[PDB]
Amino acid sequence: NYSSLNRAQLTFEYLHTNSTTHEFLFGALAELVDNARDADATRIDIYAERREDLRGGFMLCFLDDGAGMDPSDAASVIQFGKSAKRTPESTQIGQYGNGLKSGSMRIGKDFILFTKKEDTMTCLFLSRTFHEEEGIDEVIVPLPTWNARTREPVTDNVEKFAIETELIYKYSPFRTEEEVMTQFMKIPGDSGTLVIIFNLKLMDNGEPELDIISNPRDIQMAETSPEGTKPERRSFRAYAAVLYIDPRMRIFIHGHKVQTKRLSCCLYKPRMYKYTSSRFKTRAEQEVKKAEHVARIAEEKARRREADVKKRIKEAKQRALKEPKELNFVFGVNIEHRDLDGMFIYNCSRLIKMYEKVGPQLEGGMACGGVVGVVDVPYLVLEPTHNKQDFADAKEYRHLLRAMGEHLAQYWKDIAIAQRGIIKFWDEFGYLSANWNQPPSSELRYKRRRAMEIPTTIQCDLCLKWRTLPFQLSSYPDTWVCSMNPDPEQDRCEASEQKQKVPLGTFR
Amino acid sequence: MAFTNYSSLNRAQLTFEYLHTNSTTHEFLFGALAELVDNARDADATRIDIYAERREDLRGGFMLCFLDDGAGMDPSDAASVIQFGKSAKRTPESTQIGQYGNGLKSGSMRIGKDFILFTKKEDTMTCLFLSRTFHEEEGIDEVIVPLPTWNARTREPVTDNVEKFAIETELIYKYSPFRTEEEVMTQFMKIPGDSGTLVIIFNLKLMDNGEPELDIISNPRDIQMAETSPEGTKPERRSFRAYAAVLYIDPRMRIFIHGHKVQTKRLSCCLYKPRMYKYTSSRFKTRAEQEVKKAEHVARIAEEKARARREADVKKRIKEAKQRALKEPKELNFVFGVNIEHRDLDGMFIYNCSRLIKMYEKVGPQLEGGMACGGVVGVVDVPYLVLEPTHNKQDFADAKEYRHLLRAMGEHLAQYWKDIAIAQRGIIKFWDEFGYLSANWNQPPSSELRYKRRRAMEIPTTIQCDLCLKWRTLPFYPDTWVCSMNDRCEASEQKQKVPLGTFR
Numbered sequence A: 001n002y003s004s005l006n007r008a009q010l011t012f013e014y015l016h017t018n019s020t021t022h023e024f025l026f027g028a029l030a031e032l033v034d035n036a037r038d039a040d041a042t043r044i045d046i047y048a049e050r051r052e053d054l055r056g057g058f059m060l061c062f063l064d065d066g067a068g069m070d071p072s073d074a075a076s077v078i079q080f081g082k083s084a085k086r087t088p089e090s091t092q093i094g095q096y097g098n099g100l101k102s103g104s105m106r107i108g109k110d111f112i113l114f115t116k117k118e119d120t121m122t123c124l125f126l127s128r129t130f131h132e133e134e135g136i137d138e139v140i141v142p143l144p145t146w147n148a149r150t151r152e153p154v155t156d157n158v159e160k161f162a163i164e165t166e167l168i169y170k171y172s173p174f175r176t177e178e179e180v181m182t183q184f185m186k187i188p189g190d191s192g193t194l195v196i197i198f199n200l201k202l203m204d205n206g207e208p209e210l211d212i213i214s215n216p217r218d219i220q221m222a223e224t225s226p227e228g229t230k231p232e233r234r235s236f237r238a239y240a241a242v243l244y245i246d247p248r249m250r251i252f253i254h255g256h257k258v259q260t261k262r263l264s265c266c267l268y269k270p271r272m273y274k275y276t277s278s279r280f281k282t283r284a285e286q287e288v289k290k291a292e293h294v295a296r297i298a299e300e301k302a303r304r305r306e307a308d309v310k311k312r313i314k315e316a317k318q319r320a321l322k323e324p325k326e327l328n329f330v331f332g333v334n335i336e337h338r339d340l341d342g343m344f345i346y347n348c349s350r351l352i353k354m355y356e357k358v359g360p361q362l363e364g365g366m367a368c369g370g371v372v373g374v375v376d377v378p379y380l381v382l383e384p385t386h387n388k389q390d391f392a393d394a395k396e397y398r399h400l401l402r403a404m405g406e407h408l409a410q411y412w413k414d415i416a417i418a419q420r421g422i423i424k425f426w427d428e429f430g431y432l433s434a435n436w437n438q439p440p441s442s443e444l445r446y447k448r449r450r451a452m453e454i455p456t457t458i459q460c461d462l463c464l465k466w467r468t469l470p471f472q473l474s475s476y477p478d479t480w481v482c483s484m485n486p487d488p489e490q491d492r493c494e495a496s497e498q499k500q501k502v503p504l505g506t507f508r
Numbered sequence B: 001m002a003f004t005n006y007s008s009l010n011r012a013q014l015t016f017e018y019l020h021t022n023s024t025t026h027e028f029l030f031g032a033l034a035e036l037v038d039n040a041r042d043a044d045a046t047r048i049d050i051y052a053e054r055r056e057d058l059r060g061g062f063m064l065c066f067l068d069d070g071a072g073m074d075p076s077d078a079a080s081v082i083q084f085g086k087s088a089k090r091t092p093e094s095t096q097i098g099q100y101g102n103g104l105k106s107g108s109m110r111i112g113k114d115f116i117l118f119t120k121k122e123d124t125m126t127c128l129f130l131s132r133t134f135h136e137e138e139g140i141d142e143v144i145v146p147l148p149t150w151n152a153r154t155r156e157p158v159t160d161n162v163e164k165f166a167i168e169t170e171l172i173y174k175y176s177p178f179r180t181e182e183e184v185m186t187q188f189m190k191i192p193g194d195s196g197t198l199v200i201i202f203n204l205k206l207m208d209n210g211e212p213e214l215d216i217i218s219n220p221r222d223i224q225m226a227e228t229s230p231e232g233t234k235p236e237r238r239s240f241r242a243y244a245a246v247l248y249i250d251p252r253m254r255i256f257i258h259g260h261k262v263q264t265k266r267l268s269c270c271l272y273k274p275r276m277y278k279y280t281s282s283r284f285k286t287r288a289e290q291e292v293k294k295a296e297h298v299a300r301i302a303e304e305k306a307r308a309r310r311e312a313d314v315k316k317r318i319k320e321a322k323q324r325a326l327k328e329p330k331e332l333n334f335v336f337g338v339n340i341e342h343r344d345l346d347g348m349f350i351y352n353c354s355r356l357i358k359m360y361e362k363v364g365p366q367l368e369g370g371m372a373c374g375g376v377v378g379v380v381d382v383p384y385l386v387l388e389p390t391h392n393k394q395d396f397a398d399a400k401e402y403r404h405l406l407r408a409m410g411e412h413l414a415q416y417w418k419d420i421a422i423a424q425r426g427i428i429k430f431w432d433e434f435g436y437l438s439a440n441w442n443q444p445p446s447s448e449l450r451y452k453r454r455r456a457m458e459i460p461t462t463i464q465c466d467l468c469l470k471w472r473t474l475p476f477y478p479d480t481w482v483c484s485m486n487d488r489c490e491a492s493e494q495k496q497k498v499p500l501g502t503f504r
């Protein structure tokens, strides 16, 4: 019985240390968005309340209507590392167990979660302010659990509950049970979570680190974005537009839906190369081996159903001797924006590396001058880093970049636009100037010419199904729905999903 | 703290799975090893031998060790090694490179599955076996860590709870690479003096094929990356020898990799005509004033609560030193100098508190395609006020001000390039006379005799001692060298005066 031996413990100072992993504040917000997606939410409203007695001047909130949490799972939010998302496929982007505790502490000094599922209402006040102003070097976290209907306390230790509520009212932005209950009433259904991040991080001058008073329908970097600055890295709107490859959720920033785009959909002539990534053909067999000797580890762990779960994964990995034997590289020229190009790397639909030049693009010149690329890497070929902006395997990451470079060269010599004349190709679609970053011309005819090539896609708002309209609106674009769809067949909401056919090219 | 008995409220806890999550921060294995090297430097050690054993029954085939003769640790301080976040290295002038409290626990788990510390200070012998293997083979989830504390003279147990001691020794003998007590004591004898650490990292990570991630059977005097040498790869990012050569800006310690001293170099002086530019970063005095506004203020906050007192006096001591930090920090020092021996190895070599954090960072005209500033190198020692390091200590966690500094360095690099007047009189002719006579910019220098001498005349040659660790400037053998070879060990320290160029 290892009951007396020393145990590794956390401390107050570790929270800032954990926060330092995020050198990209949009990256920090992406963790809280990922948690919402993993909760199966269909709305992640990011409205920013305005409380001027808190550092920064405003509060950043995060509503949702996923599954929420219950007492045990909520308590397991302060159980650093513990993540039950380790399971077959099941996108569930979180695997490590510190994305909330690393994103909420890079944004503001404190953070107060509100959640409610089934018949429970749970608050998870974690505030560094408490620790600073009362000397606690551990990480103490109140956790009251009111009941959904009667809104009466539900816990065993009444003095614990009283103390918990006392801190929650004397430190949090809300100073009484009435206000806290009002916050709970902002989750209308019987499932959701309202993560709030009060006192914020101040830039040196004094203004907050997130700007909401320049473009009110947007969250932009408080630093004056100096030229350059590929549009995702200066606006949370643009970043969240391509923060997923398979968007089945709606992101209303400041009560305004983000025009989600699926990159690969909106491109000039796409060509989907099914590379086995040669290595990954081996690490399809070693993935079969990995899932074999990790299902064997699962058998060793089980020696029940978890091994059976991983055995069917192993059989599914022996099906990945077919299915994840090849990653899918989707090359397509981007006529509307030419300099916004480079590999758009996705690990399980969680865009990790962006605008990365691989192959001839590294060498200066029009060679692959505009080609975009996308690949969805599962959680077997590569894994992410702690910040989930880099991959923690340099060798095989560079292997994939080299592979993508060769296939990008093949795509370039397949489209043959250089043979027909790269200058003519880029001139006929509008770019008629010197600088390579010069934005397009408008001149009606050119807008139309660009428009014919790219097809139109628009997500619904009752079934969250994409469609293939010849026109466009929405549902900061204006509303539209499936019933209003001008189309003979794709008219109803019960109609089957449609996917674009992807023409294919072959390597070698 | 209790006050109203905060004893029932839930507390954030760690778990077994978090160790891998923490390990993931390091995407650079040399970066992982740098944490264990930094701990030794903070311990005032004058030797950080990285000899690798040959235990072949462990995964990987060998064990990676780290001996040193710094200050070691004691029972309490060693126990505070598993107190994630706790770090008493945040002190005025901060000669310690650690502030977070996470280098060992994040580097030892990127290298190998487990890690066993041995240490001995004053009259103590403390082992800190922390092995993921134990957790895996017994289902333990909260990270349990044995910690025996033998006495360093009698070699007898010194602890209260004998059952705890027996259990601790049992796991230490049943899981660690060495069984019994005699072997453990032999490991303790490897630390000869009365201060040191012998951090050991057994079972390793096994790159996919089966060979370990670290290569030690290609160049036995080097720990190379177990992977090919692609044509474009800066030497620091392939060889720990080259990485450790320029890991510090103020090397006052000897790094014997595989029982072989690393010829430590200071990039600040091994260059063609150097120029130190005294930029105030415009911001920096404003920033420096700003933290001096805060640092003094936040010093009152900790002092105000202690004003119950050791902290308050130290915060006051910090505050006067931070009042003096209204005088000392006003200008960083940008040291530009061309690198004739290797020109493709160029770019800003950023240092934060004498640790290297960013490597070969092209800024300014170098970002523009062309020979403009084609070879110029740069260095700056950023204090712990202007910028801070990231989780992995390879990026700075302030993008706005990091890019501000890079822009500033770009302008000053342009100024230096126009000041050396090398492009003014035939940059082709400059690189011609100093050896480069081929097509590619990356093509290595000429090797004919006269050109080697020509390169040699410009750059002076420095050499560290081996008794006082005092650098010398032998005017105008290589593995062992002392002061009386030039002119003596008691002689005053010598520093190269740096020519100064002014901005604007």
Ligand SMILES: Nc1ncnc2c1ncn2[C@@H]1O[C@H](COP(=O)(O)OP(=O)(O)NP(=O)(O)O)[C@@H](O)[C@H]1O
Pocket (backbone or CB within 6 Å): A031, A034, A035, A036, A039, A064, A066, A067, A068, A069, A073, A076, A077, A082, A083, A084, A085, A093, A094, A095, A096, A097, A098, A099, A100, A101, A193
């Ligand atoms: N909006 C939410 N709805 C439901 N459960 C949630 C929500 N946010 C967080 N959780 C739970 O809290 C846990 C902790 O979240 P987080 O700190 O993001 O770690 P993770 O998501 O488990 N893994 P990672 O994202 O890799 O750190 C999650 O795994 C969920 O179990």
Ligand SMILES: Nc1ncnc2c1ncn2[C@@H]1O[C@H](COP(=O)(O)OP(=O)(O)NP(=O)(O)O)[C@@H](O)[C@H]1O
Pocket (backbone or CB within 6 Å): B035, B038, B039, B040, B042, B043, B068, B070, B071, B072, B073, B077, B080, B081, B086, B087, B088, B089, B097, B098, B099, B100, B101, B102, B103, B104, B105, B196, B197
């Ligand atoms: N070789 C050593 N000699 C003496 N003390 C050591 C040594 N290695 C580690 N320690 C102690 O263990 C603590 C934890 O080390 P580490 O996990 O590296 O965090 P840190 O060194 O405190 N700060 P950081 O360098 O930012 O990680 C140190 O701060 C020292 O107190």
Ligand SMILES: [Mg+2]
Pocket (backbone or CB within 6 Å): A031, A034, A035, A093, A094, A095, A098, A099, A100
């Ligand atoms: Mg998560």
Ligand SMILES: [Mg+2]
Pocket (backbone or CB within 6 Å): B035, B038, B039, B098, B099, B101, B102, B103, B104
């Ligand atoms: Mg450290």
Ligand SMILES: [Zn+2]
Pocket (backbone or CB within 6 Å): A460, A461, A462, A463, A464, A465, A481, A482, A483, A492, A493
């Ligand atoms: Zn619909």
Ligand SMILES: [Zn+2]
Pocket (backbone or CB within 6 Å): B465, B466, B467, B468, B469, B470, B482, B483, B484, B488, B489
């Ligand atoms: Zn000497």
